[PDB]
Ligand binder design. Sequence first.
Ligand code: JEY
Ligand code: ZN
Length: 449
Amino acid sequence: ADLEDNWETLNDNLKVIEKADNAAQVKDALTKMRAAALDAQKATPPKLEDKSPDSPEMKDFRHGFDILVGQIDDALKLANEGKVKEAQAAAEQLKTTRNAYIQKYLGDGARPSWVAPALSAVLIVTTAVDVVGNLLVILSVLRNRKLRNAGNLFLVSLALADLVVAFYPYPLILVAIFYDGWAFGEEHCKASAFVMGLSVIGSVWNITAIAIDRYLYICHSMAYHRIYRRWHTPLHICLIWLLTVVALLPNFFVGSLEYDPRIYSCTFIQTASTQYTAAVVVIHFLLPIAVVSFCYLRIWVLVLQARMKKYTCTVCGYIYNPEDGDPDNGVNPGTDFKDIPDDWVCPLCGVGKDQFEEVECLKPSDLRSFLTMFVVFVIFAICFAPLNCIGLAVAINPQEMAPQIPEGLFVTSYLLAYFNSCLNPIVYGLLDQNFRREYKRILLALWNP
Ligand SMILES: COc1ccc2[nH]c(-c3ccccc3)c(CCNC(C)=O)c2c1
Ligand SMILES: [Zn+2]
């Protein structure tokens, strides 16, 4: 067997021990691994091919295998008794020595010189804007009670999803770029990949919940007010987060959370299971994007057909808000102006709906800031559209499509996916006037006194 062929067989057998049930499955994997390590010892590496067989740098590689086999014979000693958990622990101790000391020989992967300075700058810029911007969002909702009650309790949950990724996986990846390889343990590796899972999948379901909320508030407005929103939204936020944790659990059994050297980050691997990725691409992207598209399609058609919009009085300047109605004159909140019977008059000057003009040009802050929440979704769609397309190609047939997918395109796709984590408070400030005011209000508060 070749040195390159034996290296691949030694790695996939190490993954078998993690997904193993019986100690016999562990013992079968370690016997296959011990024999593969011995055949690899009597083979010359391609990097140090010009080096002497008894060179001080080649003899050091020979001792590395003896220290690796040394870890295998201790691991099968535990497995022969019956202890699976005790043998899987020694198997990871061998996995750490195989990626740190045996990594000197060979290196099939050749990453371009641009994937390191871009990844680092992008993560620095993302982490910096994320920690400040998304913190201001948390602070603005906690202080202002008007915004908080206007269905923007989900924004705190969406901001927390964005914030957690900047505090734990992003700084470790930045260390992994500068140290060239995952400098942290296997424990921190799978955890970082899991934290990112919550942050991405949890954000999709936070956006959907917002789209359904803004769908039920604009369309079927009267039916909405009949349904309580007091204890309902903290329950919905709790539910979508527990739904995310459930959807992320098959990664632990399949073994899809591993270090990807192409993007220097420990993330989810698309080639680990074509069945699981199919669900991640369809059930956790294509399907929720489609239902959100249906939600905002019904809102934009109402704005286009000039449905519930503000109506200003051409006599006393009374602005009729469909979100408020005219409850004292019998017009319950949620009623459209086109639905109030002709006998209705202005509750200030007493002039009929005949002499009433509509407020042309919709503000982005209007209808629980539907235009701002729409942009948020469109931005999320653009950011995660290429990666889900790459995962879709692998889910169909990775025997020919996976090696054909360029490494450059993968990094470019992953760069957008990370950048999304800081973009949300930027669109809040640019489009929502109330958010813009609150951003200045927090900044001027701690800056002056
Ligand atoms: C449920 O399994 C997990 C588990 C962990 C995951 N981490 C990421 C991810 C994190 C940051 C930037 C881009 C992707 C995905 C999303 C990866 N999706 C695709 C289609 O490749 C992910 C999925
Ligand atoms: Zn009037």
